[PDB]
Amino acid sequence: DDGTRELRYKNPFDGSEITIRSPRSEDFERVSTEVLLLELLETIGLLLSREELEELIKLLQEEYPEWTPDQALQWLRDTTEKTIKEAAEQGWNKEQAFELLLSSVPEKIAEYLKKLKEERETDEERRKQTEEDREEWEEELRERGYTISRGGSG
């Protein structure tokens, strides 16, 4: 995509000009989908950071150069959601649902997911850091007016 919003105005009265830009990665469509996808992956036992999700976006674009960043993110979201649904329909546990996600993504994607998965399990310090960045980013979104409400069965 263009990747950057812009508003530009040239003042005919005093000759000044102002250029206002902001990346599309901070728009609600991108942000809310990223919050959703991190919640989705945690449901099947994978705690990731935003920056690691951005990394999955880049690798996906390398597998499919025609895909935009938004396109790759939505495909990851949909693939994760359809993995959630099929796991709920088959009565699988979190590990089986995670295996289905690995077999639904390209080889380079799955190897990066398994690396991060192993890292969260073997490195307790970095896992706590991942959770720390997750709550920090949520608090930063709440400072911007975001409301993130969780309510389930359990």
Ligand SMILES: [K+]
């Ligand atoms: K890339």
Ligand SMILES: [K+]
């Ligand atoms: K799937």
